[PDB]
């Protein structure tokens, strides 16, 4: 259903000196749901129940996000892609996932998940993805009505907009959900970012990492690599397309449509489509996992 309640209570694991928080419910091979910016495990709360009984249902909070600890010192050089990957790779190893992982990914969760999959291909049973960063893009490929704001995040305006005014949480997030959120839902997204200043740095460092027009060159190379791999990989894929969508539209959507061994649905939503159409999304993920894990009841 819709609903504001979280899916379970979080656990944590010590990673590199820091607590990393995660949901972990049920038994079996993992179904691993990975949020991006400026969200947390809470993004999946209404989708995960659809997979009840089908696996170990796991949703990790990225470093500095949700209930995972903040990094200190923090500043403009903190919370880049490579650092998030170093923490997340460590958490995923610590979780003892084995070799039949189904990835379920969104936004920066997709860039991280796709790269992890390229580097651990035998361990990935299926990939379900939506509103993903599936390849490097140009500014012409970015949603038109948000283009100037994202240029501003990437400029020196970003610190005031994000660290002081919290605009990614307060404006971008609800602006990319079709329905109005309740105060409880907003509170859950606000929670890790209540404090002004560096507590909010992950929500600013992230737009500064998006591979657009060849910069930053390091993440562009990473995304070029996973794009090239996915476009030829025989791993079963579930593309959860959205209308109107936001990022996975135009050129990127056409590219995703070339990927092999893939099935597709389309749901209503912009970017944070989990908030508009969670039951349809969950139902599709459940059908996908049932195909991948035939139980013959
Ligand atoms: Cl971002
Ligand atoms: Cl660069
Ligand atoms: Mg501690
Ligand atoms: Mg906290
Ligand atoms: Mg477009």
Place of tokens 């170093």: 86
Per-residue tokens: 278: 């969670």
For residue 222, the Cα-to-chain-centroid distance in whole angstroms is 16
| 59 contacts 297 by C-beta, under 8 angstroms | no
> What stretch of H or E contains 167?
helix 167-167
For residue 37, the Cα-to-chain-centroid distance in whole angstroms is 7
Let me know if 107 is a catalytic residue: yes
How would you class 138 by CB atoms within 10 Å of its CB: exposed for 0-12, middle for 13-18, buried for 19 or more? exposed
For residue 84, the CA-to-ligand 2 centroid distance in Å is: 18
For residue 96, the CA-to-ligand 3 centroid distance in Å is: 21
- Angle, vertex CA 264, rays to CA 136 and CA 241, nearest 5: 50
By DSSP bridging, strand 124-132 and strand 101-106 are parallel
Place of tokens 């909070």: 61
The rounded distance, in Å, linking the Cα atoms of 242 and 221 is: 27
CATH of domain 1-297: 3.40.50.1820
Place of tokens 């944070």: 272
| 48 contacts 75 by C-beta, under 8 angstroms | no
Catalytic one of 131, 146, 198, 276: 131
With a CB cutoff of 8 Å and minimum separation 6, the contacts of 145 are: none
Per-residue tokens: 207: 């737009």
Strand positions, DSSP E, the chain: 11-15, 18-25, 30-34, 56-60, 101-106, 124-132, 237-244, 262-269
- Give the strand order in the sheet containing 237-244: 11-15, 18-25, 56-60, 30-34, 101-106, 124-132, 237-244, 262-269
Method: X-ray
Determine if residue 44 is labeled as part of a ligand binding site.
no
Cα dihedral value 186, 53, 260, 81, nearest 10: 40
For residue 181, the CA-to-ligand 1 centroid distance in Å is: 20
For residue 216, the CA-to-ligand 2 centroid distance in Å is: 4
> Preceding residues of all breaks in the chain (C to N beyond 2.5 angstroms)?
none
With CA atoms as reference, report the closest residue to 70 among 194, 158, 159: 194
Phi, psi of 103 (to 5 degrees): -90, 135
Sort residue 44 into left (φ over 0), alpha (ψ -120 to 50) or beta. alpha
How far the first Cα of the chain sits from its last, in Å, is 26
Question: What are the distances in angstroms from CA 231 to CA 49, 107, 114, 183, 226?
Answer: 30, 18, 11, 41, 8
Let me know if 271 is a catalytic residue: yes
By DSSP bridging, strand 30-34 and strand 18-25 are unpaired
Q: Cis bond leading into 146, ω under 30°? A: no
Could you tell me how many residues make up the chain?
297
Domain residue ranges of the chain, discontinuous segments joined by +: 1-297
Q: Using the 8-state DSSP alphabet, how is residue 67 labeled?
A: T
How would you class 26 by CB atoms within 10 Å of its CB: exposed for 0-12, middle for 13-18, buried for 19 or more? middle
Sign (positive or negative) of CA dihedral 295, 261, 133, 278: negative
The rounded distance, in Å, linking the Cα atoms of 165 and 170 is: 8
Let me know if 106 is a catalytic residue: no
The rounded distance, in Å, linking the Cα atoms of 239 and 285 is: 10
The rounded distance, in Å, linking the Cα atoms of 117 and 92 is: 12
Q: Cis bond leading into 73, ω under 30°? A: yes
């Amino acid at each position: 259903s819709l609903g504001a309640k979280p899916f379970g209570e979080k656990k944590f694991i010590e990673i590199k000196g820091r607590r990393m928080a995660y949901i972990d419910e049920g038994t079996g091979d993992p179904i691993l749901f990975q949020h991006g910016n400026p969200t947390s495990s809470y993004l999946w709360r209404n989708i995960m129940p659809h997979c009840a009984g089908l696996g170990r249902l796991i949703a990790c909070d990225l470093i500095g996000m949700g209930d995972s600890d903040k990094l200190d010192p923090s500043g403009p050089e903190r919370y880049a892609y490579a650092e998030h990957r170093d923490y997340l790779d460590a958490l995923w190893e610590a979780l003892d996932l084995g070799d039949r992982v189904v990835l379920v990914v969104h936004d920066w969760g997709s860039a991280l998940g796709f790269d992890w999959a390229r580097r651990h291909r035998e361990r990935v049973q299926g990939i379900a993805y939506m509103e993903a960063i599936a390849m490097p893009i140009e500014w012409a490929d970015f949603p038109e009505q948000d283009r100037d704001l994202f240029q501003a995040f990437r400029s020196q305006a970003g610190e005031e907009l994000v660290l002081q005014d919290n605009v990614f949480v307060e404006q971008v997030l609800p602006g990319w959900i079709l329905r109005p959120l309740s105060e409880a839902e907003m509170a859950a997204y606000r929670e890790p970012f209540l404090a002004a200043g560096e507590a909010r740095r992950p929500t600013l460092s992230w737009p500064r990492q998006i591979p657009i027009a060849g910069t930053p060159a390091d993440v562009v190379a990473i995304a070029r690599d996973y794009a090239g791999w996915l476009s030829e990989s025989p791993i079963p894929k579930l593309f959860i397309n959205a209308e109107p969508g936001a990022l996975t539209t135009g050129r990127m959507r056409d590219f995703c449509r070339t990927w092999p061994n893939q099935t597709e649905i389309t749901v209503a939503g912009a970017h944070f489509i989990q908030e508009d159409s969670p039951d349809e999304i969950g139902a599709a993920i459940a059908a996908f996992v049932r195909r991948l894990r035939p139980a013959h009841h």
